[PDB]
Amino acid sequence: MYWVRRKTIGGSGLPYTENEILEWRKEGVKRVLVLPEDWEIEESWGDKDYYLSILKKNGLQPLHIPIPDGGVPSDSQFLTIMKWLLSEKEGNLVHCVGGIGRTGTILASYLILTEGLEVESAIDEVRLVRPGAVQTYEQEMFLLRVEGMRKSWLKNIYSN
């Protein structure tokens, strides 16, 4: 894995073994935002529920918000993601399959919202620790929209 903001938020690809999950725990991960789709998880773990149970067995709290490869969260997914990541701010890991496109987009969007970074600066901050982070046109357009809508996103995230 890689930390974008040390011990607060980081990223990874999809683990294939429990050893990798143990290493997340050793690094200080406490909570995992699982972005792959069921079919991607099932290839490596048989069943999505089994995979989440292995995360829980290892003392990690998971949330499954499936995003297709090359894609972006829907608005409801994004609200749910940001409430999750800001609910308990320390020890958050986000992962997709490669840890580059989908995860990089979520991590960049987190920096835009929390720190007020411009899009290019947020992408660059993730790329310091994850080369190539944020891969597709759709992901770039999503970040543009999030930046432009920062105030309204924060209002909705911190409501209730």
Q: Considering only CA atoms, which of 2, 9, 1 is closest in space to residue 113?
A: 9
Six-digit token pair at 123? 């992408």
For the chain, how many structural domains are there in total? Answer: 1
User: What are residue 59's phi and psi, to 5 degrees?
Assistant: 80, 20
User: Which residues are catalytically annotated?
Assistant: 96
Give strand pairing partners of 49. none
Please state, in angstroms and rounded to a whole number, the distance separating the CA atoms of residues 121 and 54.
35
Range of the domain at 37: 1-160
Please state, in angstroms and rounded to a whole number, the distance separating the CA atoms of residues 102 and 100.
6
Pairing type for strands 2-5 and 61-64 reads unpaired
**Resolution attained, angstroms:** 1.0
Experimental technique used? X-ray
